[PDB]
Design brief:
The structure is cut from a larger assembly and holds chains A (217 residues), B (113 residues), C (182 residues), D (158 residues), E (75 residues) and F (290 residues). With 217 residues, chain A is α+β, with helices and mostly antiparallel strands. Chain A is 20% helix and 20% strand. Chain A contains 4 helices and 11 strands; from the N terminus they run βββαβββββαβαββα. Chain A starts with 33 loop residues before the first strand and ends in a 5-residue tail after the last helix. Chains in contact: A-F, C-F, D-E, D-F, E-F. Chain F binds 4 RNA strands through strand 2, strand 3, helix 4, helix 5 and helix 9. It is classed as ribosome.
Chain lengths: 217, 113, 182, 158, 75, 290
RNA sequence: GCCAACGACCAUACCACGCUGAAUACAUCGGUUCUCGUCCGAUCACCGAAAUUAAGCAGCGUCGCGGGCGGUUAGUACUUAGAUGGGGGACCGCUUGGGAACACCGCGUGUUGUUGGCCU
RNA sequence: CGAAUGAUUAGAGGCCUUAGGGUCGAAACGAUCUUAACCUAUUCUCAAACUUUAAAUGGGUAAGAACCUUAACUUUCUUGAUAUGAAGAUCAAGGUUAUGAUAUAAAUGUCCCAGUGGGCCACUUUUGGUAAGCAGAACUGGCGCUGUGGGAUGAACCAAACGUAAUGUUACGUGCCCAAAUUAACAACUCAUGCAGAUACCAUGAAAGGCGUUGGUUGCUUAAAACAGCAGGACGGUGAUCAUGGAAGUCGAAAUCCGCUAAGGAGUGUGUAACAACUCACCUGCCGAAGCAACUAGCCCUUAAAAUGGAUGGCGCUUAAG
RNA sequence: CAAAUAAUAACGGAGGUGUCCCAAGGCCAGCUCAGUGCGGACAGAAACCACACAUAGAGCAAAAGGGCAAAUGCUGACUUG
RNA sequence: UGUCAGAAAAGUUACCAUAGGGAUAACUGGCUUGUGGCGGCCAAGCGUUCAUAGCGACGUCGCUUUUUGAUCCUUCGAUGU
């Protein structure tokens, strides 16, 4: 009956999955994890900005669903329609159950009062850790200020506390912006959609001249 | 470690503990010192210890009969410090007591001897 | 690539020991279902080959053709070495040696299929009925029994191992067929 | 409420190691086991005959018996709280030679090699093991590129 | 009414009092459940030691009469 | 197949990768008991080839099998048999050569003479009294297919003719039919002396006389005629019983540094200068673009 | 420097290709009277000799894959023991010891035993 | 998790002939390939019943006369063709008993000797349960079975275990209750109008704020005269359009380009029906010295609601007695 | 579950048992399995024949787990330990 | 001999009896709150126009046991429901 995560705040247990051993797990009504111009190249969007957890919370699926829409609707309103890629980096494969007590008609007595406790899966949640990102939006550097307010508006719909980090990376790639700019300035960053390809010395040699036949020609 | 403090004794602290507090073990009994015959009658045929300064020698400069020079003694039933303690359940390096005081075992033996 | 080869050539590395002869010829008659029809179909090949053939059983059940586990649907045999060159060219002018293009496996074997089994010098003989057959010509060089011995086995390598385009090369010369690009 | 029965919990005990599957190497049957030899037990999951039961994996016994395929090993089990010495007939593939004492026996071999040439000097033969004594007084020279080379405590910001 | 079964509480206090007890070290451990054809006239490899030094160092030259068995034992 | 079953790839041993050993028989041939503590077992190893018959006696030790006696077929020219080195007949010599090669050096040739009265019957040596029996081997065939009359069973009767105690049954001796057994020593006696090789070259001047220049060539070169083989092999069965001296040679001393051909492999300073000019002259070739 | 039979350890040995190869060898190869086995002399069994750049252990080559060892990650993560430490909690700091792992980069790419031979 | 098995998110490069049909074409292969399959180099995030790797704390064993090397005897069982194995029984030869620390005396029997076989609490790890002064376990320490000192009070917390006395010295405390500092000892912090706050466990209180005050981090303006303020303009190239509550400097708003100089905004507005003005920019002033924001975490405040009258233990404390 | 020896609880979680087997036991020999690719008249998404790749991805009365490739899998040989 | 260390075994009592039990329910008291409601943040939006005159989605953080479960601690030589 969708009781909130208001009184869940000692969470203890090893993650029961949605696997071949508790089959009966539902289709999620929370599916999409990423939105914006997700077909943008690496070069389009240099700025990465994360919303990073500095607690050890248990962020709900409905909290994560709500916080993406509030991060979406501010960015399609202010900084342009398709100048962003939001990546919601917490995929909630958890099982919170419920002992439901079907106590209709007040008389049955059979099923469970305190004996015995098999459960029924209702929840789905994500453990966060300290320093561990929750969502990263990728956009240009002209809309740096517009980016942080949409992450601020998403802060007030998550539990715990969260810190908004402009990352000094160049996009979603794990490069310093200077080390991205130097390594792309000769050959070595062969681009893909979200990510680049790295510094190849192996192997074997056929994709070295193919670089050299496409640096000159 | 948390039930114990230790450190590195002076020569003066070796003497004052055996002079003032040094008792000795004579056929499982505890026998004070009062003369050199209590030390000599048990450690001169086997080992070469007859005096008190013998027993102060092969304890301070750790000699080859240290095993006998320190199991001859009883455990030194020390007093209580004057001024007392520091915390007793923090390390010495936290704010003071247990573990290695390391040269400040001397100042604390002045209070206990 | 360009790793140094150094290619020491005391002889031009031609192929005297690399014959590309015929290993064996496979003659299948996949009759649909069991009964006495295979028995009158099996006896057409002792007429053709002299060897008495074997009764292959069906692996699965289909319910769409009517075959089950072990229901004895086909009859096959195999002819190896200079007696296939009876039954190859005797069934190849029936196909008027010019043969289709694939029809030629990448493994170097090739094959074809003819209906009307009485074009093999066989009189029509309505006691047995006519049949459609399955001619498969596996093909190979000397040294192909390197992976066939039980003691101290091995694999053949790149060259030797003959492509599709050297079975076609063997076919434009022997029987002088054309490859019929379809 | 189980342990009960006999290979339970031994999903990882009698597993094989990674890529150590298959055929047993042949020196496993070429080892010689004489009566009174120290011997570890680490069971082989790929030999389902003569496996020890799970309490004795990881333990160490002495060979009290040899028969045609197995060794009787006498192993200590604490059945609480007391130690019975258990006699376990265990096949040879599940049994190893202990290295623990053949680096004691290379010291009996040196407590008679060093006491041999000590008939000339005399003393100290020094035939006891000594724990790690505190170090010495020693003169660390710098020179080495004189110091500072000075750390300061600083790595947080990200 | 169904109160409290199964605990290993106190069970090592209670088993370390009369202590945790090594068995004891024997010079003569039993030969029983041991290989019986190893044992049954190695019973008589003892019973064939009627003497061991008087009539036995006679044997060191009694077989050195035939110069021992120095070669042919090498198969 | 792509990097990820290679990570999970567990090879077979080395010799089963190369066809040499069973290891399901090697486990069971080299089995010694554990209350037979370090006693060797000395199996008899006859491996055939195309133009050699290697018979050996090896016992199982950990850092390798140790070969105690090794008689080959490429020495039977010294005993009066020049061609046909891989016969059923020419195996019984290397069977008999490896038995007399080892009983003289074990001193067990005064006793355990053997069977010079070569008949093809079953022959099992009763132990010479004043002590136990003779040297035991066990036949190790590898994965030769052990069907009746193979040459690998043509060294077990050769070695048991020397006097070794190898356990038997005549089921795989050439000339013992399958309905029933039906012992017949004479076809074994024919095969021992090389009769049916002689009978084929006495049946080939009746059918196709030109095929002497085919099969049974080099009998034409060395002049061996077909009626000689029953007395070529017969007079070899005592010239082998009279000089089993192991064929030891003494070059003294030319094995190591021979003489010129150490065959070094590309010291890594060269490989990093190999791909100095391979990289530099490629972009100069790509400077021939412009 | 090698060749063979039998091995041990069981990828530093594997996999993909490429290129050499003196000599003994090992082969492929020829045949089906014999022994033997097949639907078939392909395989197996047996007789035994007319051509070599395939096996084979290799000689190797590869900014090869895998695998192996080192470095680095990192005194990091975790963790023993301590406190009348912190904080509303979640959890975090310090004391006292112990101390990883992926990856990442670099390195090498079977070692050897017995017994018979060859000598480029 | 760029290793297998299970999941799972996104794109990127393509074998292709799987197309879901296309697209310029009747299908076209005459071209863009459209997308989705399939393949390959990557990617986000993960597993009680997954794992190449792999700790800490653990489990076992060893660390010597019951020993170490010999010599040649016994054996039917014992093996070998060995009455050399392998076990055993004897003589030979071996400095200094082969880490450390300890020894509450340890060893072994018998009464199978009595009581017991409801437990309970706690750190740490745990399972069920929304939770529980709830249910169930692992580990060691405790209460039961135990006084005494401290936490006002209290089974268990902290300290310490206890013959009967004298003396001296000790963690909790030192404004009064009440033994001992209103410390000839300090630096700060904090003003709480209906519980300021006041010692662990522990007797609850959050999210989010404060131009309350205290410290701190980042960026701009600045000794070109800013900041503030008294002193100027802010209309318009035009209802371009968007538009009739309606946009004439303006809801919305695809869109977006222009005044002037010392210096004026197609301009945010309750709605000034639509208009006007007006004024928080610009810049000439006087001023002539620091100003501006954003951010952080100390205390206090706020958030903060119960029933007999009332509880830092009580009094009472505010350059403290927090 | 279970906290890296073993032990370890709850009406904790996920299942299984009360049988089947003259071979599905014993043993030798031969053999290689999942799937995948290129092929071969009728014949297709699959019938069969045949080549190449196949680290077990199959199979083993096994519920789950371990294990296993000239086998413990598949086929024959005699068999009753 | 499946209650599997192995009696040979159907109900009902509101007409009831006995020994006990707070080792055990029924109500009070205690802890607990999934359920209801009452608050505070963020602001999609509603309100002609206008995000907060009055509201207020998706989230989020608390307070409240009394209904109501859960619990079995105190009482069964009796606490009047």
């Amino acid at each position: 009956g969708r009781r909130p995560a208001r009184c869940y705040r000692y969470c203890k247990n090893k993650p029961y999955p949605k696997s071949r051993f508790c089959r009966g797990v539902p289709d999620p009504k929370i599916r999409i994890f990423d939105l914006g111009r997700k077909k943008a190249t690496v070069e389009d969007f240099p700025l990465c900005v994360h919303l990073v957890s500095d607690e050890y919370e248990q962020l709900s699926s409905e909290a994560l669903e709500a916080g993406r829409i509030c991060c979406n609707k501010y960015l399609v309103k202010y900084c342009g329609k398709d100048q962003f890629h939001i990546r919601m980096r917490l995929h909630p494969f958890h099982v919170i159950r419920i002992n439901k007590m079907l106590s209709c008609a007040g008389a049955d007595r059979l099923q469970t009062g305190m004996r015995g406790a098999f459960g029924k899966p209702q929840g789905t949640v994500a453990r966060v850790r300290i320093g561990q990102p929750i969502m990263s939006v990728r956009s240009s550097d002209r809309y740096k200020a517009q980016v942080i307010e949409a992450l601020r508006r998403a802060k007030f719909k998550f539990p715990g506390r969260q810190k908004i980090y402009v990352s000094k990376k160049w996009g979603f790639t794990k490069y310093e912006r200077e080390r991205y700019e130097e390594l792309r300035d000769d050959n070595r960053l062969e681009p893909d959609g979200c990510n680049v390809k790295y510094r190849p010395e192996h192997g074997p040699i056929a994709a070295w001249e193919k670089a050299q036949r496409d640096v000159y020609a | 470690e948390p039930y114990i403090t230790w450190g590195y004794p002076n020569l003066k602290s070796v003497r004052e503990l055996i002079y003032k507090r040094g008792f000795v073990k004579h056929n499982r009994q505890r026998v004070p010192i009062t003369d050199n015959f209590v030390i000599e009658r048990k450690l001169r045929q086997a080992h070469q210890i007859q005096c008190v300064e013998d027993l102060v020698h092969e304890i301070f400069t750790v000699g080859p009969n240290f095993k006998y020079a320190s199991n001859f003694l009883w455990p030194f039933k020390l007093n209580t410090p004057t001024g007392g303690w520091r915390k007793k359940a923090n390390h010495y390096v936290n704010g003071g007591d247990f573990g290695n005081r390391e040269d400040q075992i001397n100042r604390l033996l002045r209070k206990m001897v | 690539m360009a790793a140094v080869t150094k290619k020491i050539k005391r002889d031009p590395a031609k192929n005297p020991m690399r014959d590309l002869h015929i290993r064996k010829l496979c003659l299948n008659i996949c009759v649909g279902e069991s009964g006495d029809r295979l028995t009158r179909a099996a006896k057409v090949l002792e007429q053709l080959t002299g060897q008495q053939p074997v009764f292959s059983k069906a692996r699965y059940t289909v319910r769409s053709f009517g075959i089950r586990r072990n229901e004895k649907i086909a009859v096959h045999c195999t002819v190896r070495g200079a007696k296939a060159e009876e039954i190859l060219e005797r069934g190849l002018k029936v196909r008027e040696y010019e043969l289709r293009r694939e029809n030629f496996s990448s493994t170097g074997n090739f094959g074809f299929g003819i209906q009307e089994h009485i074009d093999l010098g066989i009189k029509y003989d309505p006691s047995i009925g006519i049949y459609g057959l399955d001619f498969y010509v596996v093909l190979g060089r000397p040294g192909y029994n390197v992976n066939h011995r039980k003691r101290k086995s091995g694999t053949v390598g790149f060259q030797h191992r003959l492509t599709k385009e050297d079975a076609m090369k063997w076919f434009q010369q022997k029987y002088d067929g054309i490859i019929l690009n379809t | 409420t189980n342990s009960k029965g006999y290979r339970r919990g031994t999903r990882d005990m009698f597993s094989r190691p990674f890529r150590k599957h298959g055929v047993i190497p042949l020196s496993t049957y070429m080892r010689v086991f004489k009566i009174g030899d120290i011997v570890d037990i680490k069971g082989h999951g790929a030999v389902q005959k003569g496996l020890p039961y799970k309490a004795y994996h990881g333990k160490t016994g002495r060979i009290f018996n040899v028969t045609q395929h197995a060794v009787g090993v006498i192993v200590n089990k604490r059945v609480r709280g007391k130690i019975l010495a258990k006699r376990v007939n265990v096949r040879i593939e599940h049994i190893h030679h202990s290295k623990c004492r053949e680096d004691f026996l290379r010291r009996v071999k040196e407590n008679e090699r060093l006491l041999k040439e000590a008939k000339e000097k005399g003393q100290w033969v020094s035939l006891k093991r000594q724990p790690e004594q505190p170090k010495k007084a020693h003169f660390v020279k710098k020179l080495e590129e004189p110091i500072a080379l000075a750390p300061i405590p600083y790595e947080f910001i990200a | 009414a169904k109160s409290k079964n199964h605990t290993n509480h106190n069970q090592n206090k209670k088993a370390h009092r009369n202590g945790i007890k090594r068995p004891l070290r024997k010079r003569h451990e039993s030969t029983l459940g041991m290989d019986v054809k190893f044992l049954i006239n190695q019973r008589y490899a003892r019973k064939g030691n009627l003497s061991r030094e008087e009539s036995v160092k006679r044997y060191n030259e009694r077989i050195a009469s035939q110069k021992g068995k120095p070669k042919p034992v090498t198969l | 197949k792509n990097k990820q079953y290679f990570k999970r790839y567990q090879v077979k041993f080395r010799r089963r990768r190369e066809g040499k050993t069973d290891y399901y028989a090697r486990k069971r041939l080299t089995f010694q008991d554990k209350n037979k503590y370090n006693t060797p077992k000395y199996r008899l190893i006859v491996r055939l080839s195309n133009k050699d018959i290697t018979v050996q006696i090896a016992y199982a030790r950990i850092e390798g099998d140790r070969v105690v006696c090794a008689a080959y077929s490429h020495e039977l020219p010294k005993y009066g048999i020049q061609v046909g080195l891989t016969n059923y007949a020419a195996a019984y010599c290397t069977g008999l050569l490896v038995a007399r090669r080892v009983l003289n050096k074990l001193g067990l040739d005064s006793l355990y003479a053997g069977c010079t009265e070569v008949t093809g019957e079953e022959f099992n040596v009763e132990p010479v009294d004043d002590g136990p029996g003779a040297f035991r081997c066990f036949l190790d065939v590898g994965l030769a297919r052990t069907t009746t009359g193979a040459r690998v069973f043509g060294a077990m009767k050769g070695a048991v003719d020397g006097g070794l105690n190898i356990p038997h049954s005549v089921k795989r001796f050439p000339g013992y039919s399958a309905e029933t057994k039906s012992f017949n020593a004479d076809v074994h006696r024919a095969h021992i002396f090389g009769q049916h090789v002689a009978d084929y070259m006495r049946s080939l001047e009746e059918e196709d006389e030109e095929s002497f220049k085919r099969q049974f060539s080099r009998y034409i070169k060395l002049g061996i005629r077909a009626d000689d083989l029953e007395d070529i092999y017969k007079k070899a069965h005592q010239a082998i019983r009279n000089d089993p001296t192991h064929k030891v040679t003494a070059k003294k001393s030319s094995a190591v540094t021979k003489k010129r051909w150490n065959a070094k492999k590309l010291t890594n300073e060269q490989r990093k200068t190999k791909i100095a000019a391979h990289k530099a002259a490629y972009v100069a070739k790509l400077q021939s673009e412009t």
